[PDB]
Fold:
Amino acid sequence: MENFQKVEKIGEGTYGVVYKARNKLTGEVVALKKIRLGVPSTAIREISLLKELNHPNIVKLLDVIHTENKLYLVFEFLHQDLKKFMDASALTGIPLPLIKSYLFQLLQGLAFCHSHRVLHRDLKPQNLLINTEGAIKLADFGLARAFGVPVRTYTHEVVTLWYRAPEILLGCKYYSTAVDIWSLGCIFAEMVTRRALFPGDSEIDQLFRIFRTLGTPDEVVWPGVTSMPDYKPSFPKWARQDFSKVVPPLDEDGRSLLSQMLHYDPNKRISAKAALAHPFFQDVTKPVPHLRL
Structure:
């Protein structure tokens, strides 16, 4: 539209292409997501919902514009995503106080969403955006299957399984807020180690990498697991590996928190609100990253 002047393409999302743009009138600089293609009532009002969802740690959805066979999502613009910051910090690692600040802020964001009855569903470093003032924000919230598959985007681009909760992988249709805690645990481990916790290249490889590390789940640690739609008694039975080899050299408070975020049983997995009270955050501060923009 002529409301916005394209600056550059900044990404190709899971629903459409994203541009940096400026409001041709106000001069405001925003991120503009363009999705080609009635618009589902299921969607049209769960999206207009997301506009009400305002929090310092959630990327502000400024406007939703349905026009000429397209839907535009107008967002506040941030400096950089977490994935880029992680790749640029790979030599020395992100300093623990910054890791801790980011984790704390994201748990605040999640606690807010979840208390509002909103799930993200697709948490990953790519979907987290940061600024110069040390803030980190949840971006590109996943739609409830309003867009599922459908096969792909109406466009190209492969999807990451690395942060998917095991109950999703096992066919649970009615998964809960616990799925975001799982993904955030995986992101936490990755910030610490500089390397993806569970980098699977297929759904079964993803599952089996989780099992190989955390032990194949059974009715002891996860009641009802063997009755899950995609569970197979033929799954190999791996022993749980000791947790100290998983995220060294993270301290015991960190490891304790992470283990509670990676509980197999979604009903025993720690909540975002309870995680905020974990001793790990007793000395939490808000450092600023050094950002090359």
Q: What stands out?
A: The first helix runs from residue 41 to 50. Strands lie at 4-12, 17-23, 29-36, 61-67, 70-76, 80-81, 128-130, 136-138. The chain has two domains: 1-79, 80-290.
